């Protein structure tokens, strides 16, 4: 867990971004969120994750799909809780998944290597 520079564009996302987080490979990072991270230094995964969720909370069209405690947490950089149905025991937050695992040379801060997943989906990878 070392500093790095986020790279990548994510994907155009419209409507309920995390609706797909509970299925298959999860959802790509919205391009407008990539816009807030790409080219910036991150001191750690935590720092990236925080700025990620802060950016989500700061995006009216994404944050509107989160209720107040999730949105409040996200403004603090805290991963929003998934619906209980999408939690996997201890894991209850939307997971930012590295599609190519870091252990397999996956880029920690490559936004295009990230999918948001529910724990339920995440744990099946």
């Amino acid at each position: 867990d070392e500093p790095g520079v986020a790279t990548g564009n994510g994907q155009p996302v419209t409507g309920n971004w995390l609706a797909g987080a509970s299925q298959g490979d999860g959802v790509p990072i919205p391009s407008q969120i990539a816009d807030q991270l790409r080219g910036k230094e991150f001191k750690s995964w935590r720092d990236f994750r925080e700025q990620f969720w802060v950016a989500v909370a700061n995006d009216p069209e994404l944050v509107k799909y989160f209720r107040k405690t999730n949105a409040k947490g996200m403004r603090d950089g805290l991963s929003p809780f998934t619906p209980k149905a999408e939690q996997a025991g201890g894991r209850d937050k939307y997971a930012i998944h590295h599609v190519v695992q870091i252990s397999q040379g996956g880029a920690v801060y490559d936004i295009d290597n990230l999918r948001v997943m529910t724990p339920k989906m995440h744990i099946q990878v």
Partner: protein
């Protein structure tokens, strides 16, 4: 670890209020509050009662407290200490 019956309502309400109103320094710190609430609540919907209020439900510390109290009161579980 603290049961609903071990909390005053104000005490428990304070926990819920933190989730709407307090900035947590970490996910761990927030989780302590969330789980203090959810573990005590014994609401079948668990964290949803805080984080996923339905369109018809009040997204507020009061709504969460109501959803917890109503469920417990209707399902044979004790409320707060006086």
């Amino acid at each position: 670890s603290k049961k609903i019956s071990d909390h005053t309502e104000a005490e428990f309400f304070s926990l819920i209020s933190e989730l709407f109103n307090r900035s947590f320094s970490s996910e761990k710190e927030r989780d302590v509050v969330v789980y203090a609430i959810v573990n005590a609540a014994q609401h079948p919907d668990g964290t949803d009662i805080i984080f996923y209020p339905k369109e018809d439900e009040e997204d507020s510390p009061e709504g969460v407290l109501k959803r917890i109290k109503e469920w417990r009161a209707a399902n044979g579980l004790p409320g707060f200490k006086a």
